[PDB]
Structure formats: C-alpha cells, structure tokens
C-alpha cells in the first residue's frame, strides 16, 4: 500500500585527488510505486542547507512502459555543470570529473517521489567526498 522510499550507499566516504575523476555510489528502492522519482544530488550540511549538483528523472512513458535513460531529464548545476553526471536514474551513482580543491564535503543522494504526499515518499543519504592534499 504505503509507498515506500530507501536509499542506500555502500560508501559512506571516498577520495580523490583533485583534477581526477571519482564516484559517489548510490541505489534506491522505492516500495509500492512504480511512477519514476526525481534524483537530487545536493552539496551541503543537509539536503537542505545545500547546492545543487544534478538534478533527474526519467520521462513518463505510459501506464507499464519501462523507463528509458535516453528519455529523461538530467542536469548539472553551477560550479558543477558539465562535470557532473548520472549515468543510471535507477541506480543514481554520481560521477564528478576535474574534481576541483573545494569539491571536498558531503554530497546527498536525494531520491523522492515527484510529489512527496508523504513523508515516506523521500529519501537521502549523504557520501562524504575528501580531496587529497586539500580535505
């Protein structure tokens, strides 16, 4: 009944040295709801006290109709555009590139239903980033 948000990360922190390439991990299963959720990545203290990093969903295809990963929307924002990625809306792992001295904190994966009726409708987990000779 209860639609039913979770999300998991299997690293709770990782590091890289600054102009490399790294992944934040992140998966999600959303209990009794088969619409597709909207995907945030958020830099910051908390999901909310935080910028944007991404931003996705998949596009709606119709009452059954697999989601498609090149029908969807996805975004990069601010200091973080063009470096930042999502390869898979289903399984939302976050891949920075040209990873810059202050990309060093914590990164909130962010899934949510596109309305959140209810407080279960949300979730997030955060995924500490360290630069090294900068963290």
Request: glycine share 10%; hydrophobic share 35%; aromatic share 10%.
């Amino acid at each position: 009944g209860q639609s039913i948000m979770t999300v998991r990360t299997t690293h709770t922190e990782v590091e890289v040295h600054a102009g490399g390439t790294v992944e934040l991990p992140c998966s999600y299963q959303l209990a009794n709801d088969t619409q597709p959720p909207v995907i945030s990545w958020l830099k910051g203290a908390s999901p909310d006290r935080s910028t944007k990093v991404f931003k996705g969903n998949y596009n709606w295809q119709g009452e059954g109709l697999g989601f498609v990963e090149s029908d969807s929307y996805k975004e990069s924002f601010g200091d973080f555009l063009g470096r930042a990625s999502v390869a898979n809306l289903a399984a939302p792992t976050l891949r920075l590139t040209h990873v810059h001295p202050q990309d060093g904190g914590r990164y909130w994966c962010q899934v949510a239903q596109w309305s959140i009726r209810t407080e279960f409708g949300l979730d997030a987990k955060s995924v500490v980033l360290k630069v090294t000779g900068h963290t």
